[PDB]
């Protein structure tokens, strides 16, 4: 029927003076644009069809052509920035926003989807969608007593589009738009659908990827406990964004980090730091590194939860990127920790894996490790035990690696190496 039309037949139907012929041709275009492989988006654009589709969005009297054109334009907008731009340049934004209030749920949903692609292109189209007034009607679609009465796919599409209104930086979304969206986001974060939860967590992770004021906007809404709970979820698509959001939050102030600790987050890190998914391990170790950069009482919470042995484990064996994050966590720990906490660190076995990582080619991890060693030696000086630590390093082959690093081409590297040798190995 409307299957496998040529673009020229589509054009001929759309240019007819017959609304029903236009509808059939538009459905044919929709079917071309929704096929598995290589939708002919550029051919459709070049045929000049976008303004026709946009005009069809306004035909309240023929809801089927509204739907077909909305779907066609959705899929054009799903392509490259230039293809999305063609949709925007056709005037689609206000027309889709007008369709959000449609009495036909499938049409409103299609408009939600299209606005999600447009806003998802980037900060500029995101903010232009916002300026056209999309947030109010989008949120009105979610103003129901119980989200469970909404169709599952409908709610997932709304959540994803809102997450695109929260996404991207340079600039980040307008502060007032974030404040407007956040309560609905908090509500979606307690919904029981795994995809809604995943995308709500992604939105929160975007909103916390910024300066402390943005983090504070999120933390003030009281979502950290729910984020920790979701951090313990079994579905990896939920754990990943929840953990990203938590890590972002602990890049903030020590009080914000403390809200992560108070919510129980550390109790999850034995599993996270041994998680079989490499990216979970990496992100959890980065999170830890930004917790050990905090206050001594927070370092002490890391100690109490038994997480130093897990950091020793990741330093001993993990993907190299995770090992680099672990080195960072250790240097932060040693820079901020009390003497007793650093002693504890040594008693957990940090020295040998720390030394074994000095044979790595990455310059920055070498610097990080040498810093950590210096800090530990400083604690040993305060205890008068530099000799015992020197013996430790010598027995595991670390002295050979440092003395070798004296010949390292990097400046700060061979400087710190020389200082360690002449100061503690003479």
Residues of the shown chain interacting with other proteins in the complex, contacts defined by CB under 8 A = 33-36, 39, 71, 74-75, 77-79, 84, 110, 113, 116-117, 120-121, 160, 164, 167-168
C-alpha distance from residue 143 to each of 136, 183, 187, 214 (Å): 10, 11, 10, 25
Considering the complex, what minimum distance in angstroms separates the CB of residue 316 from other proteins? 31
d(CA 289, CA 269): 12
Could you give the count of Cα atoms lying within 13 Å of 48 in the half-sphere of its Cβ? 5
Phi, psi of 309 (to 5 degrees): -55, -35
C-alpha distance from residue 8 to each of 14, 15, 42, 384 (Å): 10, 10, 14, 87
* Chain CA centroid to CA 353, Å: 30
d(CA 230, CA 217): 20
Phi, psi of 141 (to 5 degrees): -65, -20
Closer residue to other proteins, CB minimum distance, 71 or 310: 71
Closer residue to other proteins, CB minimum distance, 84 or 323: 84
d(CA 415, CA 392): 22
Closer residue to other proteins, CB minimum distance, 17 or 38: 38
Closer residue to other proteins, CB minimum distance, 202 or 269: 202
Closer residue to other proteins, CB minimum distance, 117 or 226: 117
The number of beta carbons lying within 10 Å of the beta carbon of residue 80 is 11
Considering the complex, what minimum distance in angstroms separates the CB of residue 164 from other proteins? 6
Q: Residue 150's closest CA among 182, 112, 114?
A: 112
Closer residue to other proteins, CB minimum distance, 39 or 337: 39
Considering the complex, what minimum distance in angstroms separates the CB of residue 78 from other proteins? 4
Could you give the count of Cα atoms lying within 13 Å of 389 in the half-sphere of its Cβ? 27
> What are the b/e assignments for 158-196, b being 16+ CB within 10 Å?
bbbbbbbbbbbeeebbeeebbebbbebbbebbebebebb
Largest CA distance in the chain: 95
| DSSP helix/strand/coil, 187 | helix
Considering the complex, what minimum distance in angstroms separates the CB of residue 214 from other proteins? 19
Considering the complex, what minimum distance in angstroms separates the CB of residue 5 from other proteins? 18
d(CA 227, CA 133): 30
Considering the complex, what minimum distance in angstroms separates the CB of residue 46 from other proteins? 19
Closer residue to other proteins, CB minimum distance, 75 or 248: 75
Q: Which residues have CB under 8 Å from 311's CB, separation 6+?
A: 273, 285, 288, 326, 329, 330, 333, 350
Closer residue to other proteins, CB minimum distance, 116 or 337: 116
Considering the complex, what minimum distance in angstroms separates the CB of residue 141 from other proteins? 18
Considering the complex, what minimum distance in angstroms separates the CB of residue 122 from other proteins? 8
Considering the complex, what minimum distance in angstroms separates the CB of residue 20 from other proteins? 23
Q: Residues in the chain, how many?
A: 426
Closer residue to other proteins, CB minimum distance, 114 or 366: 114
């Amino acid at each position: 029927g409307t299957v496998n039309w040529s673009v020229e037949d589509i054009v001929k139907g759309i240019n007819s003076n017959n609304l029903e012929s236009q509808l059939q041709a538009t459905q044919a275009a929709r079917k071309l644009l929704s096929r598995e492989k290589q939708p002919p988006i550029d051919n459709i654009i070049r045929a000049g069809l976008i303004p026709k589709f946009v005009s069809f969005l306004g035909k309240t009297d023929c809801s089927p052509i509204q739907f077909e054109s909305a779907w066609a334009l959705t899929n054009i907008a799903s392509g490259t920035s230039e293809q999305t731009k063609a949709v925007v340049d056709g005037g689609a934004i206000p027309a889709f926003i007008s369709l959000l209030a449609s009495p036909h749920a499938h049409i409103s949903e299609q408009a939600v989807w299209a606005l999600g692609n447009i806003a998802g292109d980037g900060s500029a189209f995101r903010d232009l969608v916002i300026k056209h007034g999309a947030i109010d009607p989008l949120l009105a679609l979610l103003a129901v007593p119980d989200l469970s009465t909404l169709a599952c796919g409908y709610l997932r599409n709304l959540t994803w589009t809102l997450s695109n209104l929260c996404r991207n930086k340079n600039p980040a979304p307008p502060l007032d738009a974030v404040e407007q969206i956040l309560p609905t986001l908090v509500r979606l974060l307690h919904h029981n659908d795994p995809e809604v939860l995943a995308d709500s967590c992604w939105a929160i992770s975007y909103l916390t990827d910024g300066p402390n004021e943005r983090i504070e906007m999120v933390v003030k809404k009281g979502v950290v406990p729910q984020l920790v709970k979701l951090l313990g979820a079994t579905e990896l698509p939920i754990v990943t964004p929840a953990l990203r959001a938590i890590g972002n939050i602990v890049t903030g102030t020590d009080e914000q980090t403390q809200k992560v600790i108070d919510a129980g987050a550390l109790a999850v890190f034995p599993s996270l730091l041994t998680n079989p998914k490499t990216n979970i391990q990496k992100e959890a170790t980065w999170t830890m590194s930004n917790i050990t950069a905090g206050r001594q009482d927070q370092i002490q919470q890391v100690v109490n939860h038994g997480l130093v042995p897990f950091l020793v484990g990741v330093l001993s064996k993990a993907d190299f990127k995770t090992q680099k994050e672990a080195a960072w966590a250790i240097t932060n720990y040693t820079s901020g920790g009390t003497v007793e906490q650093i002693v504890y660190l040594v008693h957990c076995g940090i020295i040998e894996p720390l030394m074994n990582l000095l044979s790595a080619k990455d310059t920055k991890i070498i610097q990080v490790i040498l810093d950590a060693i210096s800090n530990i030696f400083q604690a040993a000086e305060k205890l008068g035990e530099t000799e015992k630590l020197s013996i430790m390093i010598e027995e595991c082959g670390g002295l050979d690696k440092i003395e070798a690093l004296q010949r390292h081409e990097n400046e700060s590297v061979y400087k710190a190496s020389l200082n360690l040798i002449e100061k503690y190995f003479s």
